[PDB]
Amino acid sequence: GGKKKVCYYYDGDIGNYYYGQGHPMKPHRIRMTHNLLLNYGLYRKMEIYRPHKATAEEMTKYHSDEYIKFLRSIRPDNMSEYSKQMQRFNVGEDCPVFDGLFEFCQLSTGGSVAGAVKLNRQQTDMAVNWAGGLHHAKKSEASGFCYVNDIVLAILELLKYHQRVLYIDIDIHHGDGVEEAFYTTDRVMTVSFHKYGEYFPGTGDLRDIGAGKGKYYAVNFPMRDGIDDESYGQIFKPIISKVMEMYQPSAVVLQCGADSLSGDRLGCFNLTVKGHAKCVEVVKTFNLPLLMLGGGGYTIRNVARCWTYETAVALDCEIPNELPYNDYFEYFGPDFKLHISPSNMTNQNTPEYMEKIKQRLFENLRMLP
Numbered sequence: 001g002g003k004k005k006v007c008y009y010y011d012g013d014i015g016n017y018y019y020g021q022g023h024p025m026k027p028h029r030i031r032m033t034h035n036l037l038l039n040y041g042l043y044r045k046m047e048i049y050r051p052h053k054a055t056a057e058e059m060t061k062y063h064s065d066e067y068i069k070f071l072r073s074i075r076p077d078n079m080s081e082y083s084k085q086m087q088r089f090n091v092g093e094d095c096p097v098f099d100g101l102f103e104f105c106q107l108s109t110g111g112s113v114a115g116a117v118k119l120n121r122q123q124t125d126m127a128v129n130w131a132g133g134l135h136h137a138k139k140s141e142a143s144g145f146c147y148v149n150d151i152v153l154a155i156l157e158l159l160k161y162h163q164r165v166l167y168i169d170i171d172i173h174h175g176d177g178v179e180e181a182f183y184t185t186d187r188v189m190t191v192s193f194h195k196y197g198e199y200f201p202g203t204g205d206l207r208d209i210g211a212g213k214g215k216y217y218a219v220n221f222p223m224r225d226g227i228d229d230e231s232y233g234q235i236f237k238p239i240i241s242k243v244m245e246m247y248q249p250s251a252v253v254l255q256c257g258a259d260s261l262s263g264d265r266l267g268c269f270n271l272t273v274k275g276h277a278k279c280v281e282v283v284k285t286f287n288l289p290l291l292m293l294g295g296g297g298y299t300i301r302n303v304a305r306c307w308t309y310e311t312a313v314a315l316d317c318e319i320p321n322e323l324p325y326n327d328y329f330e331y332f333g334p335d336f337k338l339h340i341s342p343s344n345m346t347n348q349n350t351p352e353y354m355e356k357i358k359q360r361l362f363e364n365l366r367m368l369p
């Protein structure tokens with residue numbers, strides 16, 4: 001029990017990577033998070049590391065050599081010469097070409113793999129990489145603003161020392177990239193809670209339960225618009241508890257995508273920072289080596305609030321609602337508070353729907369030996 005050792009990864013350059021004018025993915029939110037938690041004084045309670053830049057040698061442990069060579073070569077000045085390669089790898093539109101794309105992928109991946117190495121070495125209880133959690137990237141493809149799947153790479157590192165690794169994804173979108181990589185193995189159980197029905201990426205049906213050796217090791221909780229803290233918490237704690245009891249993993253990876261928060265530019269959920277962070281508190285109570293990662297989140301003031309509070313939660317540190325002064329203070333107007341209020345949006349997930357989906361998952365969890 002009690003307070004635990006926390007290692008946090010951050011590179012001072014991460015906030016300078018720009019996806020382009022009008023693009024919702026803003027790496028600057030990672031800097032906003034870092035600045036906000038330094039101003040709360042949370043650096044006193046944790047070890048801050050600079051990630052290494054993950055190499056091609058590291059990336060090719062999962063990704064194809066051809067895809068990684070392309071990512072390492074593509075620049076906005078040579079796009080015309082790589083036209084075929086761009087369409088094949090899904091680069092240029094949703095996943096645009098930008099200055100320092102590869103470096104950005106290296107730093108994002110570096111923090112996740114370094115966190116996994118630290119946990120494997122038993123030198124920390126928790127590792128945090130807010131620049132990670134890029135769950136959509138595939139063996140040979142970019143998708144949903146994700147080029148390199150840092151989660152898969154970090155999980156592969158944990159598998160060197162851990163027989164069973166549990167993956168939890170509280171981003172509003174299905175973590176299809178992670179699920180795909182470990183679909184046919186029982187050495188990784190993937191658990192995703194996401195909006196489902198005519199929504200990106202279009203995967204993550206209740207009936208998608210894994211295949212072969214991995215059958216019953218892929219868990220999906222499909223949800224509708226406007227889920228609140230009360231509905232989410234009532235299903236999250238029982239599902240994770242049953243997963244912990246049945247699967248008994250030795251390490252956990254928690255993807256904390258903040259696009260499941262109320263008011264998100266691309267999200268349809270109605271969670272508050274408190275409701276989102278209760279997921280961290282739940283997972284932390286199991287006392288297993290834990291890797292906390294980023295993901296989506298497009299109302300960057302709420303991403304900074306979310307991930308600052310989730311770091312404070314990892315540290316068992318009570319932080320006041322009144323925000324301290326920081327370099328992005330004006331972003332947190334008009335209230336300048338850490339916590340957010342839900343909107344008036346209708347919760348399309350009834351309590352009966354929530355209970356029925358939970359019961360269906362419980363039947364699948366009983367199939368585990």
Ligand SMILES: C[C@H](CCCCC(=O)NO)Nc1c(Nc2ccc(OC(F)(F)F)cc2)c(=O)c1=O
Nearest residue numbers: 021022023024094144145171173200259266296
């Ligand atoms: C459907 C796909 C969903 C990606 C979710 C990834 C995630 O959170 N993973 O958990 N992509 C989308 C947009 N893309 C978009 C791209 C560029 C852009 O700006 C532009 F380039 F157009 F100027 C505006 C929107 C949207 O806007 C939007 O939605």
Ligand SMILES: [Ca+2]
Nearest residue numbers: 169171173193
């Ligand atoms: Ca999810």
Ligand code: NA
Nearest residue numbers: 182185188217
């Ligand atoms: Na699996």
Ligand SMILES: [Zn+2]
Nearest residue numbers: 171173259296
């Ligand atoms: Zn997302």
